[PDB]
Amino acid sequence: GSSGSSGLGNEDFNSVIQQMAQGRQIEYIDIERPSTGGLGFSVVALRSQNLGKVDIFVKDVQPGSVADRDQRLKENDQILAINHTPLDQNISHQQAIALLQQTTGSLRLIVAREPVHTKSSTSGPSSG
């Protein structure tokens, strides 16, 4: 369905994000939009199950570009909102991409991450 209002109602920007994350730890990845460069990362569109919507995930995180050398954007990071705008059922996968290809100077991305649970994922820093 479609609706139009001035602001928010039952569900606010803080609620929508908290609902899409599902408790998952949310992180604000602030990226500095370069002048002679780009985000340095790609995104994938995958229709979710919750409801007519698309889940944008950060793929091909060029390990060395601003996204990294500058920010700490991780791969497979489901973007909940972009520049103060959630990609809920309201916004499709396309719109999400625009906000990026459009948003200049500063580009914020609120992604979620799954917590730890008797996982014990072996991870260590490698020098070379």
UniProtKB/Swiss-Prot annotation:
Q: Where in the cell is it found?
A: Cell junction, Tight junction; Apical cell membrane; Cytoplasm, Perinuclear region
Q: Where in the body, by tissue, does this protein show up?
A: Expressed in renal tubules (at protein level). Expressed in bladder, testis, ovary, small intestine, colon, heart, skeletal muscle, pancreas and cerebellum in the brain.
Q: Which residues form the PDZ domain?
A: 28-115
Subunit structure, briefly? Forms a ternary complex with PALS1, CRB1 and CRB3. Component of a complex whose core is composed of ARHGAP17, AMOT, PALS1, INADL/PATJ and PARD3/PAR3. Forms a heterotrimeric complex composed of MMP5, LIN7B and PATJ; the N-terminal L27 domain of PALS1 interacts with the L27 domain of PATJ and the C-terminal L27 domain of PALS1 interacts with the L27 domain of LIN7B. Component of a complex composed of CRB3, PALS1 and PATJ. Interacts (via N-terminus) with PALS1/PALS (via PDZ domain).
Write out the function statement from the record. Scaffolding protein that facilitates the localization of proteins to the cell membrane. Required for the correct formation of tight junctions and epithelial apico-basal polarity. Acts (via its L27 domain) as an apical connector and elongation factor for multistranded TJP1/ZO1 condensates that form a tight junction belt, thereby required for the formation of the tight junction-mediated cell barrier. Positively regulates epithelial cell microtubule elongation and cell migration, possibly via facilitating localization of PRKCI/aPKC and PAR3D/PAR3 at the leading edge of migrating cells.
Any notes on this protein's domains?
The L27 domain (also called Maguk recruitment domain) is required for interaction with PALS1 and CRB3, and PALS1 localization to tight junctions.
The protein, known as: InaD-like protein
